[PDB]
Amino acid sequence: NIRPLHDRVIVKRKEVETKSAGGIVLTGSAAAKSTRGEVLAVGNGRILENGEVKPLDVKVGDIVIFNDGYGVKSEKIDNEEVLIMSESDILAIVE
Amino acid sequence: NIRPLHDRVIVKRKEVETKSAGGIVLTGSAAAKSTRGEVLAVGNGRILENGEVKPLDVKVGDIVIFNDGYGVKSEKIDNEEVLIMSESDILAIVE
Amino acid sequence: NIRPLHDRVIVKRKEVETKSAGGIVLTGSAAAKSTRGEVLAVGNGRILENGEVKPLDVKVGDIVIFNDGYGVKSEKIDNEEVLIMSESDILAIVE
Amino acid sequence: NIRPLHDRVIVKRKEVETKSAGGIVLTGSAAAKSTRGEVLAVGNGRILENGEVKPLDVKVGDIVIFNDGYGVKSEKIDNEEVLIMSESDILAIVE
Amino acid sequence: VKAPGFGDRRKAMLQDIATLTGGTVISEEIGMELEKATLEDLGQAKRVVINKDTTTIIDGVGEEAAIQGRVAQIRQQIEEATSDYDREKLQERVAKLAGGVAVIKVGAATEVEMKEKKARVEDALHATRAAVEEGVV
């Protein structure tokens, strides 16, 4: 297992959809990278100016929407791609 | 359903008008894209420096005027694209 | 010995893996620099704005995943290349 | 006799090493300029937001490892090169 | 010193020196780096003399079997060689590996006399080669 530090969350990207709103199969740049994932591990919490920590709002087991950028980092663990990124990159939680 | 995190708001922007100040149909770049929307989900609120959170000013149901920028993102949910963006991009509330 | 100041941590990255997912030997730019290390020294802790100091979450002996960048400085100590970097560059701790 | 203000430290850079790990002599751009020094004087302390001062961690007589950059400035005292740099530029102290 | 040749022939000459001296060539296309080199990848000789224009490797310490294999390979390459320039270069390489290289310098007082004597010496050289290979009548 791998546990992140502070406000970092480990997520696993969902597979890209093949058929889009019907039987039309998309191949190439038409199918963009998925922006939804499964939360695997969560950090302890952010550090406030006072020094106290507060727990993250996102929990393990939820599906989240995130924006890919420079802050989101890819690491190869257990022969499977996972994403390590801060809670500021979590936009919303599905359901 | 989808709920945002902290001070993010999901909006559904309105369609561009065709007839402008009469019957004159605008086609091309003349009809600028709409900068108004309907808020669908409202986040819990911004986290202050001390640690406390405060509720957001905009409630679900009203009309907002915003500015499109790099921080604003577009997401496709329920086969209908929505707009996810922070409260700092909200300028005013119509009515 | 060498001890860091404030929130800096000294790590020594692991040797790059050659055989990947089987016997295939990797040579060239495909074999990227390893982003895992074993912590050797840990600083006292970061100074808060109010004045007190808080200890780092990483202890000596752990294996960490770090993000290489301009913040990470490469320093050659006792004929052994080790990396001195701030704790903000440490992403997660393995196990 | 000069004393730095606030969180600044005056150091003298150690001479570059020519004989490297055996008999081989190094001349030219290969011999990078040394990144170790000797602290001569230490400022009173960094000024916090509230108003009180915090004494510096480095003490006179120590050997320090620093990162050369735009913040480190070179000036002449008693016809000898010394470096005026902030205490934040010191990475670690040897022994 | 700089390695002789230009291109593929440079690689061939380097490999010939490696086989003669008993060493290994450090190349990126084979998967080795100069920082990893050890004393085992270094060739050996007995005497090396370098001047303003020439380099001579005297009495390389290498096993004769490898040299024989290399010269046999170059002979096979010769057997499938078309142009005379390529054959001349290959035979020079075989001479460097196994035999020697001799040069005859023609001396004459003027330039027309030099040209005539040089032409006659070249004819004699060709005739002796032919007689050695196929007999005389």
Side-chain angles (χ1 to χ4, degrees), chain B residues 9-14 36-42 56-66 85 87 90-94:
Chain B
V9 166
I10 313 174
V11 308
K12 177 70 74 68
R13 71 199 308 163
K14 304 150 74 203
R36 285 156 190 255
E38 181 65 26
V39 294
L40 295 174
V42 59
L56 306 175
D57 269 336
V58 65
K59 288 326 280 173
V60 168
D62 63 358
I63 303 295
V64 298
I65 310 155
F66 59 92
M85 65 182 179
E87 193 191 53
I90 311 294
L91 275 68
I93 294 157
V94 186

Side-chain angles (χ1 to χ4, degrees), chain D residues 7-14 16 18-48 50-69:
Chain D
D7 57 351
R8 293 195 199 64
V9 166
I10 190 167
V11 308
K12 65 164 160 187
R13 210 199 289 263
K14 283 187 180 295
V16 64
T18 58
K19 179 173 186 286
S20 77
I24 320 295
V25 188
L26 276 296
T27 55
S29 67
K33 182 69 176 177
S34 180
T35 46
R36 285 155 194 258
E38 182 65 26
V39 292
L40 300 161
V42 164
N44 290 318
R46 185 179 67 189
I47 315 301
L48 313 170
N50 64 7
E52 293 179 353
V53 298
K54 185 68 175 178
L56 282 69
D57 291 331
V58 293
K59 303 292 183 287
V60 64
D62 285 343
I63 306 108
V64 296
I65 302 169
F66 57 87
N67 174 56
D68 202 322

Side-chain angles (χ1 to χ4, degrees), chain A residues 1-6 8 10 44 47-48 50-53 73 75-77 79 84, chain C residues 21 35-36 46 48 50 54 57-59 65-67 87-88 90-94:
Chain A
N1 261 328
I2 290 187
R3 65 179 177 88
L5 288 161
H6 305 96
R8 299 179 191 282
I10 294 171
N44 189 359
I47 302 297
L48 309 163
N50 189 359
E52 182 65 26
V53 300
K73 188 268 183 181
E75 173 82 20
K76 190 70 181 293
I77 67 168
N79 294 305
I84 302 168
Chain C
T35 80
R36 289 160 194 262
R46 202 202 38 210
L48 314 175
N50 63 7
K54 185 177 180 180
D57 276 321
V58 292
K59 65 178 72 66
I65 304 165
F66 59 89
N67 169 51
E87 199 282 340
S88 309
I90 290 189
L91 289 174
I93 321 168
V94 186

Side-chain angles (χ1 to χ4, degrees), chain B residues 79 81-90:
Chain B
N79 292 304
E81 57 92 19
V82 294
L83 202 68
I84 293 170
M85 65 182 179
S86 183
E87 193 191 53
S88 302
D89 291 331
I90 311 294

